[PDB]
Design a protein around this ligand. Structure first.
Ligand SMILES: O=C(COc1ccc(-c2ccccc2)cc1)N[C@@H]1O[C@H](CO)[C@@H](O)[C@H](O)[C@H]1O
Ligand SMILES: O=C(COc1ccc(-c2ccccc2)cc1)N[C@@H]1O[C@H](CO)[C@@H](O)[C@H](O)[C@H]1O
Lengths: 807, 807
C-alpha cells in the first residue's frame, strides 16, 4: 500500500502464507475451524520470528570471529512495548505480511492489537533503555542489554469512581514467542553469609544461593541484518515438613516476580536490593566468562564497557572489585584501575528524595563483603580528596560515600562517580546543573569525568511504526534514507512554502485524529469532536510534572465560557493520562481531580463540544503509539530545573504537534533547534526559580493578586467539583497554598497568556501547519542514533557502522 | 536392526533428518557448533511430536462427528515416565529415528536418557492410570485422562550415609515438549464462602476464586492412528501493600505445586483437600460444557462415564449433585439418578489407615455447600438401609457416611459406594475380601454394584519398549499380532521343548543382565557378577510389603556362608529398591538396614562374589524399564490379604523372571494361569492369617523355636550391623518382637525353604528356562488391554475396537 512498508513480492507472500499455515497446524495444534484471533496472532508471530533466527545466529558468530569491544547496558528496566510490528519494520517485512494475511482472510492490524506490551519499566528511564537497544543494533555495535525478566511488569491501571486501581500485569499468561530460555547458561548468585579472613585474603562463606536463569530476546537493527541480544535473568531455587520445604522455593523465586512501580521517592526495601544485586552478580559472571573465551585483565577495559542506567545497578562496581580481588587475586590498585576504566554512570534526576541511599544495616546483613569493599573504596577516595583540598573538612563530609545520621546510609551516586571514568547527564541544562550544584565537589576534584549526552528516541518505533502516513509523505519528497539518518529531515525546510506539502502534512494529522477519536468510542464509549485542538499531557503523575497547572488552565477556560457563553473560543479536547505510583497519595488525588473536572465540564450543556476533558486510562507504550500521532499540542510544563531531559517531548515534535513548555530539560535544546519563534515558551527559567527560593515562595501573594486564580481555589475548597464530598480536595488546596515545592501559582499567569497565543495560531490552519513543518524538520538532533554515536565515541571508545551484514 | 521396531525407508529417513535440522535451527536457535546432547534430544522430541499432531486433530474431530459415549478417567496421579521412546513405538517410527540419528552422527539411546520422567504418581495406582490411558487409545475408546499438572512430582531419592534424603523433582526445568498449554480453556474453581438460602434454592456466595488452566498431552494408540488426550490442570491466581499483594498470588498457585508422597497412612491436610476439589470442579465443568455442545440431562449417562481412581476424586459425586441441583435446577431424585448412573468407583486397599476420612470442620470451612449435600445423601441412604433392615441400629451406624468420635469425619469410601452404579476391586481375592469383610454391609444392601476388574500392564512399554530383544525372538516364532492381543503368547507353549528357543530365551536374559551390570558401574561405580542369580524386590517401602522378610533371608544366607565357607552355594545379587514416604520412620529405618547389611556383606573376603546386596537408588518408571528385563527372581512377598493386586509382579512375569511369592493379590491369578508347579508359592494363606489373629500372634514363639532366626535377632540387637551405634536397630527388633501387624516371623521358615528350591532350580539352566517359557506364555491375562475391555463392556457400556483411523 505505502512505500516505506517494503516490497510484497509473489515469492515472499507465498512463503509467508505456507509458514503461517505450518505454525497454525504444528506449533499451535489448531485448524481453521477452532482458531481464535489469538491463535492467528501467534501463528504470525512465530512466522516472523523464524526470519530473525538465521541473522541472530550469524550476528553472534560474527562477534565471536571478529572479537570487537563489547558494550553491556545494565538496566533494571526495559520498557519494550510490543515486538511484532517493530520486527516487521526492521526486517522490511511489513507489506508482505499485510498482503499474506489479507490473502488468508485476516486483518493484520487486528492481530497486532492482541500482543501484550512487555511493560518492564516505569516511564522515561525504562523506555530510554529500549530506544538505546534499537539504536545500538542499527549502528552495528556488539551490544547486550542485561536486566531482569519480571513475571509482572508495570501494573494495569483501571479507573473506578474517578480513582486509580492497580491490577497485576500478567503479561506472560499466554506465553512470549519472542524469548528463548537458556536453562544451560544458569548461574549461581549468593546472599547473606559472612566474611572470613585467611592468609590468602578474604572469603565469603555460608551464603544462601539463588540461581539466575537467562532468557534471550532478539534485538533487530534497521535493515542491516544485525540482531543483538537482550538477556533477562529469572530467579530459580536450587534443588536442595517436606511439603512446606517445596512451597518455600517461592521465597527465592520472588526476586524476579514484580517490577517496583515507585519512580519518585526512594524507599529502601530489602527485596529491591536483592533484585539489584541479582542482576549485577549474574551479569558480571556472564561478562567475565565471555571475556575469558577470547589471566590478563589489563586488556579487560579494551574489550568490555559497562554502562550503568542510573545507580540501580551501582553494585556492579564493588562486585567487579570483589571478583578481581577475592577470586582472581589481583592487587587492589590494579583491580580498581580496571574497574574505573570499565564502568560509566548515567544520572537521571536532581530531586534529592529520588537518590538511592541504602541503610548500612541492610548491606551488612545481605552483602557483608560488598560493604567492606565500599568502606575501603571510601577511605581511599577521601584520602585523595584530603590531598587535593587540605584542611577542607566539610568537603570530606559532603563527598563521603557514607552518610552519617539517624541511620548510616550509603550514597550510591557517590559510589558511582568514584568508580566510573565517565558520568553524564541526559540534557545540556541537566548536565550543567550536575556540575554547578549537586555534584559540584566531584566536578572540582575530577572535571574530566563529567559529560553531557542529550537523550533521543528511535525514529523507527516513534515515526515509521506509529505514524506511517507521515513517514510516507516525507519519503515522497526526500527519500527513505532519513529513517536511519534523521538529520536529513532538515531538507524539509525547503517545503515550508510548498502548498501540496502543507496540505499533506495537515491531512495526515487529520487522519490520525479521526482514527484516535474512533478508538476512543469503540474501546471506551466516549464522544469527542475531531475538529477540536488535541491538547495532550501524557507521562507519569508527579507533582514536579505539574499536571495540576494544566488542571488550573482547564478550569480557567471553563469559567471563561460560563462567564461569556456566546463568545467564540477555539474548541479543545484536553487529554491527560499517566500512572501514579501506588504509595503516592498526592498523585492519586490529582488523578481524581482530573476525572472530577471532566464530570462537570463534559456534561455542561452551555459548554457543548467546545471543551472536553478526558483521562486516558492505562497509559503505556502501545497507547503512546496511538495518541502521540493524533496530538496537536504537547504539554511539557515541569518547573524549570526539575525534568532532567524528557523524551515524550521529542516523540511529539517528531509527529507534528507544537510544544507549550518551560525552559527545562531537553525543551531548551528543542527550542534552540527549531527557533524560539516556533515554540510556545513560558514561565520562570531556572534563574528565576533560584531568586524565588532566596526570597521565599509565598503562594498567598498570587492568590491575592489574581482574581481568576482566587475563583478556582474557592471552587475547589467549597466543593464545586465534589458536590457530595465538599472537602474532598482540601489536601490539594492546602498543598498549593502552603507547601508547593513546584511553584504552580508562580507560572500560572504566563501559562494562561501563552495558551491564548496557541488558540490564536490554531485559528490560522495554514500558519499552524507551517510552524509544524519547521518543528519536524529540526527534530533530527533527537534521534537516539545521534545519542548512541556520542556514547560510542566519547565514552565507550568504539566506532559505529552503518554497513549491512550478509543475508 | 530388529523387526518389531518398524521400517526405515529412504523417504522417511530423509524427511526425519531435515525436520531434525529444521527444529535445531528454528526451534532451539542453535547450530551444530554449540549444540549439547540436550539440544539434540529436544530436536528429536519436536521432530517426533510433529508426527502426532495431524492424528491428534483428526481423532478429536472424529469424536465430534461421531459423538460416541466419552470416558473420563479422574486420577490425582498419572505416573507416565518418559514419552519419546513410547511415542516412536506406537507410531512405528523407532527404526527410522534410529537410522536418521545414526546418519547425523548421533546415538539415539543416549539422547533417550536425557528425557526427565513425568513422575506424577507414587507407585502402583499412578502407574495403573498410565497403562490404562495407553490401552484406551489402543482400543479406540473416546477417553480422556484428567488430573493435576504438578510442578514437582515424586521426590528424587538420594542415599547419604545409608539414609534416604529427598530432593525436589524439578521435572519442568528445561521445558516439556509433549504438552500444549490451553490458556483459552481456563475455568474458575471456588473455595470457602458460605451458603445462602433463597426461594429459588441454595446459593454458594462470597467465595475465593482460583483459575484452572489446562495443559493437554497426546496419548497415542498402538499403530491405529488414534491419539487421545490427557488434560492436566494448573492453578493460576485471578488478576484482581501493592508488592505483597502481587507476591501473595503464590498462595493460590500452590494448589498444583507438589504431589503428596505419603502413599500409606492418610493425613487430612487442607492443601490436599484443595487439590482434590480443584481437579474435580474444573474437570466436571469441562465435561458438562462438552456434553452441551452435542436441557436433557436424562441422556447424560448415555454420553458420559466418570471413573474414580480410588476416593481421591470422590468429591465428583457431590459436585455433580451441586451443579445439577443448584445450577441446572433439576430436582434431587432426578439428579441423583443421573449421578449414580454416571459414576463408578475403583478401590485400591484394605488397610484401615489408608482410607480417606475427612474431618467435618475442614469441609465445613472449605466447601460448606458440599457438606450440606453429603449430609443429604447420607440421610436418604440411611433411610433406605433402615427400610431394608428394620431394627438393625448397629448397621445404621456402621454404614453411615458420617463417622462419630473425637472429631466427626466423612468416610469417602462410603460416599463413593452410595453414589456409584459400580464398585470394583483390582484382583479376584481383593474383590472377594471387599464383599466378605470391609464393605460387607454395602454388598448385602446392593449386591449388583460389586465387581472385580483384575489389574494389567501395557505390553507396549512393559515388553516392546523395555525388552526389544525378547519381543523380537517372540515375533520370529509367532508374528507381531501378540503386541495388541497378548493372549497369543500361549502359542509359545509349543516351543517349551524347542532347543533353539530355549537357547534364545536364555541368551536374551543374559544380554539384559550384562547391560544392567554395566549400567551399575558406569553410573554408580558398583561391582557385580553377571553370572549370579538376579534377586530383585522393587516397589515402595512399606511394612506390609515385607522388605524386612527379604532382609532376614539375606542375613540367613550370609550366616550360612560364614558357618561353612567352603561349601558351594548358588551366587546371588540381591537388589532392593523403592522410595519411603517422608513421614514414615519405620520405612526409613528399613532402607538404612538394607544398606547396613550391604556394608558388611559386600566387603567380607570370605563371601567373595557369591553374595552381593545392592540398594537401587531412586526407583522410578525409567529405572524399572532397566532392572525388570534383567531380573531372574521377582520378590512378591506381602502378607496374605494386604496387597490388593500388585502390578510390578506382572511386569516381571512378562519379562522372563520366575516369581517367589505369597498367595496375595494378583499372585493368585498368576499362579493359576501358569500352573502352581511353575511358581514358587510359600507361606500363610489369608485363612491361616485369620486363624493366627483369632489366637493372637506371639512373635516370641518363633524366636524360641528357630535357632537361625534367634541368631539374626541377636546380631541386630547387639550391633553387628552397626558397630559404632550398637542400638541403631532397636526400633526394628522391638517392632518385630512385640508389634508386628504383618507377621514377618510366621512366614520365615517356609520362605527360607522355598528360596532353597529356587537355588536348586537355577543350577539347572535348561529347566529354569523351560519354567520361564511357561510363565511368559501364560502372562496374556495380565495385559491392560484385557482389563480395559472388561471395564468398557461391564461398567462403561461401550464396545472397544481394534480398527485403524485413516492416516
Ligand atoms: O524514568 C525516570 C526514573 O524512573 C525510575 C524508576 C525506578 C526507580 C526506583 C528506584 C529505586 C527503587 C525503586 C524504583 C526510580 C526512578 N527518570 C526519567 O529518565 C528519563 C530518561 O533519562 C528522563 O528523560 C526524565 O527526565 C527522567 O525523569
Ligand atoms: O498405589 C497405591 C496407593 O497409592 C496412594 C497414593 C496416594 C495416596 C494419598 C491419599 C490421600 C492423601 C495423600 C496421598 C494414597 C495411596 N495402591 C496400589 O494400587 C495398585 C493399583 O491398583 C495395586 O496393584 C496395589 O496393590 C496397591 O497397593
Amino acid at each position: 500500500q505505502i512505500s516505506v512498508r517494503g516490497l510484497a513480492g509473489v515469492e515472499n507472500v507465498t512463503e509467508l502464507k505456507k509458514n503461517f499455515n505450518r505454525h497454525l497446524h504444528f506449533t499451535l495444534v489448531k485448524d481453521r475451524n477452532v482458531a481464535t484471533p489469538r491463535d492467528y496472532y501467534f501463528a504470525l508471530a512465530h512466522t516472523v520470528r523464524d526470519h530473525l533466527v538465521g541473522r541472530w545466529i550469524r550476528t553472534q558468530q560474527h562477534y565471536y570471529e571478529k572479537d570487537p569491544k563489547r558494550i553491556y547496558y545494565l538496566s533494571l528496566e526495559f520498557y519494550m512495548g510490543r515486538t511484532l510490528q517493530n520486527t516487521m519494520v526492521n526486517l522490511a517485512l511489513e507489506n508482505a505480511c499485510d498482503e499474506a494475511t489479507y490473502q488468508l482472510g485476516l486483518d493484520m492490524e487486528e492481530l497486532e492489537e492482541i500482543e501484550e506490551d512487555a511493560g518492564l519499566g516505569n516511564g522515561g528511564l525504562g523506555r530510554l533503555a529500549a530506544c538505546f537497544l534499537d539504536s545500538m543494533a542499527t549502528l552495528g555495535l556488539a551490544a547486550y542489554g542485561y536486566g531482569i525478566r519480571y513475571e509482572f511488569g508495570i501494573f494495569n491501571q483501571k479507573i473506578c469512581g474517578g480513582w486509580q486501581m492497580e491490577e497485576a500485569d500478567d503479561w506472560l499468561r499466554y506465553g512470549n514467542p519472542w524469548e528463548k530460555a537458556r536453562p544451560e547458561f544458569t548461574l549461581p548468585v549468593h546472599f547473606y553469609g559472612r566474611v572470613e579472613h585467611t592468609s590468602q585474603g578474604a572469603k565469603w562463606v555460608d551464603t544462601q544461593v539463588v540461581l539466575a536463569m537467562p532468557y534471550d530476546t532478539p534485538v533487530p537493527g534497521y535493515r542491516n541484518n544485525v540482531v543483538n541480544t537482550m538477556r533477562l535473568w529469572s530467579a530459580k531455587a536450587p534443588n536442595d515438613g517436606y511439603i512446606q520445604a517445596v512451597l518455600d522455593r517461592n521465597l527465592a523465586e520472588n526476586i524476579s516476580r514484580v517490577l517496583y512501580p515507585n519512580d519518585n521517592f526512594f524507599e529502601g526495601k530489602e527485596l529491591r536490593l536483592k533484585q539489584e544485586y541479582f542482576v549485577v552478580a549474574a551479569t558480571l559472571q556472564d561478562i567475565i566468562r565471555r571475556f575469558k573465551s577470547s589471566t590478563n585483565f589489563d586488556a579487560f577495559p579494551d574489550k568490555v564497557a559497562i554502562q550503568l542506567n542510573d545507580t540501580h545497578p551501582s553494585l556492579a562496581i564493588p562486585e567487579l572489585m570483589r571478583v578481581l580481588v577475592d577470586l582472581e587475586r589481583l592487587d587492589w590498585d590494579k583491580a580498581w584501575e580496571v574497574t574505573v576504566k570499565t564502568c560509566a554512570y548515567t544520572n537521571h534526576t536532581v530531586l534529592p528524595e529520588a537518590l538511592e541511599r541504602w541503610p548500612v544495616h541492610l548491606l551488612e546483613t545481605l552483602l557483608p563483603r560488598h560493604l567492606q569493599i565500599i568502606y575501603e573504596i571510601n577511605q581511599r577516595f577521601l584520602n585523595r580528596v584530603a590531598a587535593a583540598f587540605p584542611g577542607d573538612v566539610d568537603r570530606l563530609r559532603r563527598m563521603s560515600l557514607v552518610e552519617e545520621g539517624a541511620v548510616k546510609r550509603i550514597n550510591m551516586a557517590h559510589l558511582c562517580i568514584a568508580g566510573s571514568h565517565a558520568v553524564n547527564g541526559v540534557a545540556r541544562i541537566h548536565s550543567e546543573i550536575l556540575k554547578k550544584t549537586i555534584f559540584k565537589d566531584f566536578y572540582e576534584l575530577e572535571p574530566h569525568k563529567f559529560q553531557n549526552k542529550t537523550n533521543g528516541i528511535t525514529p523507527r518505533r516513534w515515526l515509521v511504526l506509529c505514524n506511517p502516513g507521515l513517514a510516507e509523505i516525507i519519503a515522497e519528497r526526500i527519500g527513505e534514507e532519513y529513517i536511519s539518518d534523521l538529520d536529513q529531515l532538515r531538507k524539509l525546510l525547503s517545503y515550508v512554502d510548498d502548498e501540496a506539502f502543507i496540505r499533506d502534512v495537515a491531512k495526515v494529522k487529520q487522519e490520525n485524529k479521526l482514527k484516535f477519536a474512533a478508538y476512543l468510542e469503540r474501546e471506551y464509549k466516549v464522544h469527542i469532536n475531531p475538529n477540536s485542538l488535541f491538547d495532550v499531557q501524557v507521562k507519569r503523575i508527579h507533582e514536579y510534572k505539574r499536571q495540576l497547572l494544566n488542571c488550573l488552565h482547564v478550569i480557567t477556560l471553563y469559567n471563561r465560557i460560563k462567564k461569556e457563553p456566546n463568545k467564540f473560543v477555539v474548541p479543545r479536547t484536553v487529554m491527560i493520562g499517566g500512572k501514579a505510583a501506588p504509595g503516592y497519595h498526592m498523585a492519586k488525588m490529582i488523578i481524581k481531580l482530573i476525572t472530577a473536572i471532566g464530570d462537570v465540564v463534559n456534561h455542561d450543556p452551555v459548554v457543548g463540544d467546545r471543551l472536553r476533558v478526558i483521562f486516558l486510562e492505562n497509559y503505556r507504550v502501545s497507547l503512546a503509539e496511538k495518541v502521540i500521532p493524533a496530538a496537536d499540542l504537547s504539554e511539557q510544563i515541569s518547573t524549570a530545573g526539575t525534568e532532567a531531559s524528557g523524551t515524550g517531548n521529542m516523540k511529539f515534535m517528531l509527529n507534528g504537534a507544537l510544544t507549550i513548555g518551560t525552559m527545562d530539560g531537553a525543551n531548551v535544546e528543542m527550542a534552540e533547534e527549531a527557533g524560539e519563534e516556533n515554540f510556545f515558551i513560558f514561565g520562570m527559567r531556572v534563574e528565576d526559580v533560584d531568586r524565588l527560593d532566596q526570597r521565599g515562595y509565598n503562594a498567598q501573594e498570587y492568590y491575592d493578586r489574581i482574581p481568576e486564580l482566587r475563583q478556582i481555589i474557592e471552587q475547589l475548597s467549597s466543593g464545586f467539583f465534589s458536590p457530595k464530598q465538599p472537602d474532598l480536595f482540601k489536601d490539594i488546596v492546602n498543598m498549593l497554598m502552603h507547601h508547593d515545592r513546584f511553584k504552580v501559582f508562580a507560572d500560572y499567569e504566563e501559562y494562561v497568556k501563552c495558551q491564548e497565543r496557541v488558540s490564536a495560531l490554531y485559528k490560522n490552519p495554514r500558519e499552524w501547519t507551517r510552524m509544524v513543518i519547521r518543528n519536524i524538520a529540526t527534530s533530527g538532533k533527537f534521534s537516539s542514533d545521534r545519542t548512541i554515536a556520542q556514547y560510542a565515541r566519547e565514552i565507550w571508545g568504539v566506532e559505529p557502522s552503518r554497513q549491512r551484514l550478509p543475508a
